[PDB]
Amino acid sequence: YVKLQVAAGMANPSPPVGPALGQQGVNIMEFCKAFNAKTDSIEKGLPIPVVITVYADRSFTFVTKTPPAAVLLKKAAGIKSGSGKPNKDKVGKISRAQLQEIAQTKAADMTGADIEAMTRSIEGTARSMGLVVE
Amino acid sequence: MLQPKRTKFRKMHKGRNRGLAQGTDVSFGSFGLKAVGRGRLTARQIEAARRAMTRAVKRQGKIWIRVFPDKPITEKPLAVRMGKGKGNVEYWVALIQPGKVLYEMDGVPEELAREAFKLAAAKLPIKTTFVTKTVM
Amino acid sequence: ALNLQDKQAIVAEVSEVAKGALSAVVADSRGVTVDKMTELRKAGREAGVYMRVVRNTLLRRAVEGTPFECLKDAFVGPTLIAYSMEHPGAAARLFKEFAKANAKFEVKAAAFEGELIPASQIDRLATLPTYEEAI
Amino acid sequence: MKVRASVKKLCRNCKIVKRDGVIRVICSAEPKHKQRQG
Amino acid sequence: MFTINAEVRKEQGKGASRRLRAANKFPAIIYGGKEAPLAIELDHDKVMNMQAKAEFYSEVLTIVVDGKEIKVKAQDVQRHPYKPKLQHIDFVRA
RNA sequence: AGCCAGGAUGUUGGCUUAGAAGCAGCCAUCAUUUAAAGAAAGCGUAAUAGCUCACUGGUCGAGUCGGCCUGCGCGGAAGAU
Ligand SMILES: [Mg+2]
Ligand SMILES: [Mg+2]
Ligand SMILES: [Mg+2]
Ligand SMILES: [Zn+2]
Structure with missing residues (x-):
């Protein structure tokens, strides 16, 4: 549960984040594209505060700000x-x-x-x- | 260091250091370093204490030195017998009596003045105390 | 003066708040995250309910001058108390929903009609409708 | 430890203790701060 | 506002004053006006506390001796050269 | 004093930087919700998660803090038959 992957207008934010999210087994490429499709209406240079939720079930639960x-x-x-x-x-x-x-x-x-x-x-x-x- | 630009005479009698001091009040600044003990304050010690205060306050505020070394102190050269005239002037001291205000400060907080005066007091051969300006 | 003046004042604010307060529902306030109370506090703001907690001693001095000698027994330990300053009632229901659904304190007491309301009889104030019903 | 004539607290975690007629400084945080008057 | 209890000194001089100061007192003098100056003694610690407030040196002070009260002002003070103590005080009749 | 709870929102403040999210550095340090909460006191970290302080309510139930003057002691204190 850490704020990351802002500037959703830019895809695959590995250079800014990189090994920070490597602890969680989250598909960096796959999830970034999916979030882009959900929220591509916003301006490209606009950060979105999102969290990465991990539990026993590994079920992602995110809400947009x-x-x-x-x-x-x-x-x-x-x-x-x-x-x-x-x-x-x-x-x-x-x-x-x-x-x-x-x-x-x-x-x-x-x-x-x-x-x-x-x-x-x-x-x-x-x-x-x-x-x-x- | 501090020493008279010129003097009437080159050498001075040893004398004594009895009595209490004149100049016991904080007259210029608002805080002062008053001397409790009695003894001599060499020019080197006065300069050493001045630097400790000045760096402690980072050259902010104003500092008054209320004592001046005007008494020449002579010493014979090493391994020299007695007599054959008085020795040569080596350094200058200021005679200090109890109650003498030695340094004064203004333009700084009281707490900063206390540590500034505490640092200088460790450079002096005489027990001292911290005093503040008094109305009347 | 200082903080004694401030506490003398603290009683003053809750005193005149109780002057305009109509119905009071007292609950507890321990073991729950502060951010969780944002829901109840926002509800109180929009529903005209004012909440505050003074010490058992400040609570003792601050209700003698207001008609609130009925709820004097239940002042033990932490005492959260909310006051409906407008649209009286609809406060026991607002607390019941948060109490039974979160596995915590049920209720402490209430205050209406110049008499103390026990814990098990707060359903009347929880089921009490709005003031606008004569139409 | 530091054996010196003047022993004093060097941080907020240092504690002045007198254990056998000697003054000691024990620090729960900095082992460098351990001193003894001597 | 500042009221000081005093006693008339029965013996004066260098020796008597030192005995007074050893006994946690100190002498003071009240003069001014058409009457003769009056030499009195003050208990040190109480006066030492009042003199800490600056108003002591500015307001009219009241000194009670033998029941009689005199309105005075602090005209001059003699402090110990290096100790936080008072040696003598001059009071002018207000 | 100890013990319990909380220590939030704007917000990752602006700049800088590959990153700089209270916590390399520079500038600012306001505003809300508050019972309180710094644009952060220290640890942390590649950058953040994370720990804890200030700060606030609860418990406890009577003293408790830090100066001043002063008496007597303590350390500082190692030599040769
Ligand atoms: Mg042993
Ligand atoms: Mg004599
Ligand atoms: Mg000794
Ligand atoms: Zn330490």
Whole structure:
């Protein structure tokens, strides 16, 4: 049960992971293609947090999440770095409508939050990252 | 090290070191290293303690040295008999009496000052204590 | 002041919460993973149920000024208590489902109508319908 | 072990103990921290 | 706010003062105004605690001797050269 | 103090890197849910799983921490018939 195989848009993620999943007898090629077919609608450069579940029965049980918020930069901010030194520079600004769109997008994952509190929560990440609003 | 740029006389009598000290209060900084014991503070010891403090605070804040070595100490050359005049000046000391404030510090936290003064005190031949600036 | 002030305050928050609270269902809170309570806590938020745990002593001082002298007997060991501040009832059922289906504590007590509800008689509050039924 | 005039705790796991009229430092973590006053 | 109990000294001088300081007391002087200065003695540890608070050197202090109370201010203090102790204190009548 | 439980979400924070997920390094260190929980105190690891600390509730039931002044002791303390 370890988060791995992100960027589902790129097939066979052996170079990043490699011998990490060699402990589990999981077909790297076969499962990667199957996950691609299930979730090929997303953008190619989008990570998906997935786990590798092992039990006595060796029955895989996986549930899909939302792409991480940080890779969510080219949607409105149009940046790929944010800041080598965060809060010391300025590369862009995020519109109030954008994070709210992510707010309902990520509402299925926030363990504890309200619609308003989640919006205030994800703006904290943007401020600490370097993005601003208003 | 510290030594007078010039002096009225080259050599000085041995003298004595009786009495208590003048300059017992923290006058410039906010923390001070007060001398409890009595004795001589050579220029080398004063410099050695100064470096220990200065590196401990990483050259932050301000440091005052309240003592100056102005008494010349002479020594005859090795394997030389008595008499034939007074020996040659070898180093300079400062006479220390109990209660003398030797070093002062400012611009650093009190705890950092304590360890900084503790490191210097290990370089001195005289028992010392940590004192703080007092109102009146 | 410090933490004594904070505990004096801690009683204050639960005190005025109990002023607006209508029905109380007390349960236990031990041996269960914290992330598992996310389901009940989210349910309380959306169903207007407020939950909190003060010490047996803070629980002792905090209910004398509110009409809650009925449930004084069941204050032994850990005391989780949730308060329905709106849409009264529908709390015993919300806890029964999580209790019987997870192999843990059944129930501690309840509080309604100015009288204590025993453990075996909580079905009335579990089966109690919503306030909107006169229509 | 270290035999020295000044023995002191070198980490949070060191303990000052007096065992036969001598002061000792015993460490559950670092065997290098074992000292004795002598 | 700061009230100090005091006793009038019956013997003065170098020897008497040292005996006082050995007995965990210390002398002090109250002067100012049109009346003669009054030499009194203070118990060291209690005054040592109050003088730690800075307000002691700024506010009006009250000294009680023979029941009578005098409002004074700390005019000057003589500390031990290297020990955390007080040797003498000057009080000016407020 | 000991013992029990928890130590979560965003999130693998941003940058860097082959990888850098609290834990090589650089910058930031906010926001929620909270009873608490650091953008992580130490071990870990190719990178992560994993251990544990801070922190919080429970048990226990009365003292408990660290300075200051001071009396007497301890170590420091090895030589030759
Ligand atoms: Mg033995
Ligand atoms: Mg005499
Ligand atoms: Mg000795
Ligand atoms: Zn150690």
